[PDB]
Amino acid sequence: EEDLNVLAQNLKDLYNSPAFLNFYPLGEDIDIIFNLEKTFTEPIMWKKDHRHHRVEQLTLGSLLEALKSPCLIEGESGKGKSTLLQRIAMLWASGGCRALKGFRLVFFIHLRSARGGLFETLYDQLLNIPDFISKPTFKALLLKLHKEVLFLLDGYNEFHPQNCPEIEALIKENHRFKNMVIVTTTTECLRHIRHVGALTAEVGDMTEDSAKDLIEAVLVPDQVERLWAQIQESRCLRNLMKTPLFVVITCAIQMGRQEFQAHTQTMLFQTFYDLLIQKNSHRYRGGASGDFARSLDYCGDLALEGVFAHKFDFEPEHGSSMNEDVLVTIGLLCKYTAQRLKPTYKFFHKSFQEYTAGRRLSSLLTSKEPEEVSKGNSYLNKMVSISDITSLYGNLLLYTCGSSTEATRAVMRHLAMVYQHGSLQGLSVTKRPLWRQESIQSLRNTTEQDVLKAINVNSFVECGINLFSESMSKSDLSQEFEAFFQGKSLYINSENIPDYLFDFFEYLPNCASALDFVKLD
């Protein structure tokens, strides 16, 4: 037992290493803060089932209390759940839980870089195994203890079984081991393992209070306060708080000395997009067979054909899913080989797909080819009803104009001409500050649908001023925007006025010179 006492003693005391406790949360390229003491929050989890049902909202300790080897843990793309697993082994080195205290053997390996035999691969990252502890003593010890044995296995997205068939045997053939094993991966190749293991649980979203803990944890309170004021304005950004990686990027850009508040949200999607291009440039070797920009064009064409035809699930036929699995292998969208006949392919966020069609759209307006630019004008030709632009195409052209100055001018050429209202009976107002509904208001105009036309035009002007504000082409296309809002009205509630109106009168006041009126509350 003295072998286990000394070696397991130095492994109980070995797992507080600063390299074991810190890494680069955006891969390996950029010097970025990590701390299990600070950066770690408590994420939400869901106990799965055969129906793929979110049965029980598992926490970390509740997952420890519900131990079923093999423990299958899956989640989203680019998460880096070695925060979770190294938190488990670190609190095992620090006395985290009683169920953690009941263990004796806790391991952890990167399956993306594991190679050689199991004794040798664990020797590749420990290096403290003398000749006195032999390999039959090693593996016969692991099978010998049989209950206090525990493995943390991560990185199956880049695991290769020819590097170690013994580890893949530890995954599948647990009956020849019967040791406590934990496998953590994504849904990229979850279908290969899922049927074998017993426990299955997912990592859910991230709560706004744990995100509040993460933002308040790692940054000065001025940037936290005013960046948090940007968080508590945009409801769409509050939908974007359901993943930690956006929170890392917002705590990365504003990290520094100043309020970098030019990064409204379109630069956030550009930073996230091109940052995932940076992290997955040669992590998955980009486009290994067939180049990278071709698959970028494939993802953008999925975004245009999806969003323009109002399609947000993506199940192509078998055999034609090559560049699909290329882009999921990169980490663009989530594939789903779950309980469904043909596998499901969808983006993790709908408006993020709208950003992909946005930068794709400006990208097809960018080149000097007349077929892609005029074809982009044919994508503009899918908008003749101005109300459906507000209901659907608002965030699309918002991200398109905000992403580049070049696409803005084409948006001016098309939306400067389109005037037809479209649907109003199926598009009545859901929420409004017009809470008083008198008959004298009906005595102004008996046709309530013309008042709904005024709501359509005024919300269209809301999309226009929000469009110019997010565009940040602050002093350039003044004759076009001044020629835009002529023959257009403006409804303003005076009881809730944000600062982009101040930017509107600030930057282009001649557009306010060319308005019709403001119905002011």
Binding site: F23, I33, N35, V218, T271
Partner: protein, 401 residues
Amino acid sequence: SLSEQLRDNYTKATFRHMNLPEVCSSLGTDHLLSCDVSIISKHISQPVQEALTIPEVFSNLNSVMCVEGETGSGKTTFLKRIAFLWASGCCPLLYRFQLVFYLSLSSITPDQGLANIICAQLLGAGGCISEVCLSSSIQQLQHQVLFLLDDYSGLASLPQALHTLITKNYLSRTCLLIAVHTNRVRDIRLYLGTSLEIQEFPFYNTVSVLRKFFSHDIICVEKLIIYFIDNKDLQGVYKTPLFVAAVCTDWIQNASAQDKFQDVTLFQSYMQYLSLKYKATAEPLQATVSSCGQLALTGLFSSCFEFNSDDLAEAGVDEDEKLTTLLMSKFTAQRLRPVYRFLGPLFQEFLAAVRLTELLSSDRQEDQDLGLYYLRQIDSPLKAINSFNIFLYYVSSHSSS
């Protein structure tokens, strides 16, 4: 007995010697005859934690630690300070520290461990005790072993026991120190608990050095301190306390400052030391001078100081020449595109003055059209008093005409 031999060897008396009196060569040390700096102790998750002192380093020691400063200057003065004053034993934790190890890795990458460099640049590492048995003497008495490691920035994974010791720093429960510059703190950051920054306090350090080493002449010291409040940003140019040896030669070896004491003679002499130190031909040492001179033209061009690292069309390549030359550096933590920093923001204007005489008395194709170009971008007379006072008074050196 190995600890007795190495304890007898690490108290070396000739170990004191430093080229801080380089050609002056004054009879004196650099601790009893020179003042000190402090510690900007910075936490890894961005609070500026404290500003500790040198016994405050000893209180809560760090098992692996990095400091930033200037090589040749303070950082190796801090390491040789630790060893040489570790040959004294005055602090109430001293005499009970066991085995320090001074090491400068800028010379070597010798793919061999202790016997290579202890037998190479020092006396010897023992033959009856093997080099791994010397490493076993490390890994049998770990708890009081103190390391003085220098310059991972000129180091790769080629030394075997060294780099595998650094990447497996738990396996020796020791105290490790390292002195890498602010260009490559990121490779050490995976193995750090806290960062340490050397910073001059030019309130008192420059008048302590120029006091003690120049008590021969104290009326120009009166000129210095009266100049400190006529020019209240005198702290804004004294930014490294152990490259004030150019000032030392500009008192004992250049007596012209005794009747011409204003700023441009002083840091003109510092620039002349930058010509003397690393004495070479017209390499991109010299095009690092001119090319960072036009980095300074971009500096005062649009008043941009902490740079973008986009337009490296001015200087660009071989960053070891520009950080070894030390006219600039870059950002430590994450940015989107990382940010260059200077030793002195107003010293950059003197670099642009070197750029201006380079663009004033040289090839007349388009070079003096660039100096004429920015020199016509500044064409307003009410700006001329202040901006042309400071910057064109930096131009009032370099008399070429």
